[PDB]
Amino acid sequence: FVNQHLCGSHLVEALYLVCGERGFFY
Amino acid sequence: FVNQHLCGSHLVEALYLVCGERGFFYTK
Amino acid sequence: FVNQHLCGSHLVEALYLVCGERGFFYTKP
Amino acid sequence: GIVEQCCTSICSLYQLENYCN
Amino acid sequence: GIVEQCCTSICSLYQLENYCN
Amino acid sequence: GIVEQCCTSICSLYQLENYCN
Ligand SMILES: [Cl-]
Numbered sequence: 830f831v832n833q834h835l836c837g838s839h840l841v842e843a844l845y846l847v848c849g850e851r852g853f854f855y
Numbered sequence: 856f857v858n859q860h861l862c863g864s865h866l867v868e869a870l871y872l873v874c875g876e877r878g879f880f881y882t883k
Numbered sequence: 884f885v886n887q888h889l890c891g892s893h894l895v896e897a898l899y900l901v902c903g904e905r906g907f908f909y910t911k912p
Numbered sequence: 913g914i915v916e917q918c919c920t921s922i923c924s925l926y927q928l929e930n931y932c933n
Numbered sequence: 934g935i936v937e938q939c940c941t942s943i944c945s946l947y948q949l950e951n952y953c954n
Numbered sequence: 955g956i957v958e959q960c961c962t963s964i965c966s967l968y969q970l971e972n973y974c975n
């Protein structure tokens with residue numbers, strides 16, 4: 830629910846950092 | 856409840872974006 | 884342990900704000 | 913790209929949706 | 934406003950408390 | 955320190971790891 834929603838916000842933040850210039854598709 | 860506390864932090868971030876110059880009033 | 888992970892992220896920002904110039908030593912449970 | 917448009921001036925929500933899928 | 938105050942120099946906790954209800 | 959090293963040019967993951975315990 831919102832727990833997944835809030836987790837997803839942190840995931841896109843983490844992918845932004847981890848993926849560098851490669852980027853990601855969410 | 857911490858889960859509600861963390862949710863509210865995300866809510867105020869979202870309201871800041873959505874409300875623009877209108878602003879918003881957040882209270883527990 | 885995902886919930887503890889998310890909580891910890893917010894705790895680190897809280898310490899960043901409240902500790903100011905003092906800094907903080909952060910360790911996992 | 914989104915950086916030159918939205919980091920040099922504020923993008924409205926509508927301008928941001930142009931980068932959605 | 935608060936941006937002209939707390940985004941031109943970093944506000945202390947006391948200065949941030951100015952904005953509490 | 956980390957602010958001097960990482961707040962003008964972007965620090966990679968490896969560079970950030972230098973600041974872990
Ligand atoms: Cl969260």
Ligand SMILES: [Zn+2]
Pocket residue numbers: 835839861865889893
């Ligand atoms: Zn969160």
